[PDB]
Amino acid sequence: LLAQSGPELVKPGASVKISCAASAYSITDFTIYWVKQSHGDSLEWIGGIDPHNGGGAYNQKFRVKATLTVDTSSSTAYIHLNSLTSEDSAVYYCAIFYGNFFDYWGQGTTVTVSSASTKGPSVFPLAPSSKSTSGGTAALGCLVKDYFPEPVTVSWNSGALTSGVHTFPAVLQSSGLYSLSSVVTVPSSSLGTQTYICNVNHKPSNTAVDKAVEPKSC
């Protein structure tokens, strides 16, 4: 589960400690390493350690920038990133591996270096109506507007609804804030049986919204 710490908004010049814990098994029984991914593309190996049999290593590039530590007591790994700049904005992956086995990675931690303050999103319903229903199919959703930084998780009915859901990539507005929509397709005959709730989470601002989206009325 390599459970990693949540998304972080850090001001330039500041630092951050990203944590990583193997729930169920002791993470320090294996070799742990971190990788940096920028712009959702290129992967950079930062370094790693193996608490029990040495062979810990750093990437010359991140020597000054990063410090890796382990906490055997609570089976948790750490990376310390100091003197952060905009070039440090990225997704950081914690990974553990043993010889010829599991090469297992964590969900990743999004780090954004900004002098800007967090802004939680507004969540408005995208109500289904005769103009949001094709035949027996209806579309509905949630508009997640004006937030910073990334990311933001969206789920439907607490995760019980996954088929037909499209969650769009966030897009920047001229305000410098992010915005995205999440829509789902459902049987138009179901519109009046089970409720539809979108679960929006924005960790950096501590925003947790549960918006119910119902057909338009007057």
Binding site: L43, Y93, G106, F124, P169, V171, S181, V183
Partner: protein, 213 residues
């Protein structure tokens, strides 16, 4: 002295059923200490192969790797829709460990025309001073599509943005949203809102509209 891994190609589109090959060339002899990763949209990179040709548990046998020294290959046979992803080669012979630039595998499929839905701005948002109109184009191929906004028949410009989904894992189609943003005041001054969409799958443009109220 630093092992740069050059991956090819950058993008690769294939049909369900086909054999595809991804190349990776190391600037320096790396033996057989090469591995391959697959990163599906929204997920962490997952490890497929190690030691050039060995597959990790739970990895389909239609994924095989080969090569030695400086040249390496990832072959994906009977390509399936679920395979849509970004692939990375890696060298762990010498420190630091390095990755290739990655290869994006996209799946070709037949033309599919989009389903179009329009959504007026919610009442809750209007009480906040702004108005977002959303036009959804659902489950279409290929990716290119034209969304035109018209307000009381007047063609809009400079006030909308588009977002596009990554190809779907099951049916390989795309979805698209187009958001028209007006001020509460400008939205209230007009009546007919419409998004017109043009697409390879439609023999003629499709228009979806609604009246304010």
């Amino acid at each position: 002295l630093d092992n740069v891994m050059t991956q090819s190609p950058s993008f690769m589109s294939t049909s369900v059923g086909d054999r595809v090959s991804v190349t990776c060339a190391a600037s320096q002899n790396v033996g057989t200490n090469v591995a391959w990763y697959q990163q599906k949209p929204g997920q962490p990179p997952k490890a497929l192969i190690y030691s050039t040709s060995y597959r990790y548990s739970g990895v389909p046998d239609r994924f095989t790797g080969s090569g030695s020294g400086t040249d390496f290959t990832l072959t994906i046979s009977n390509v399936n829709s679920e395979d849509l992803a970004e692939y990375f080669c890696q060298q762990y012979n010498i420190y630091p460990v390095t990755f290739g630039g990655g290869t994006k595998l996209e799946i070709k499929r037949t033309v599919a025309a989009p389903s179009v839905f329009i959504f007026p701005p919610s009442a809750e948002q209007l009480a906040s001073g702004t108005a977002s109109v959303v036009c959804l184009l659902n489950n279409f191929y290929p990716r290119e599509a034209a969304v035109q906004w018209k307000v009381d028949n007047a063609l809009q410009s400079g006030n909308s943005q588009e977002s596009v989904t990554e190809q779907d894992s099951a049916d390989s189609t795309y979805s698209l949203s187009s958001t028209l943003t007006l001020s509460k005041a400008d939205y209230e001054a007009h009546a007919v809102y419409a998004c017109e969409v043009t697409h390879q799958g439609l023999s003629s443009p499709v228009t979806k509209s609604f009246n304010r109220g």
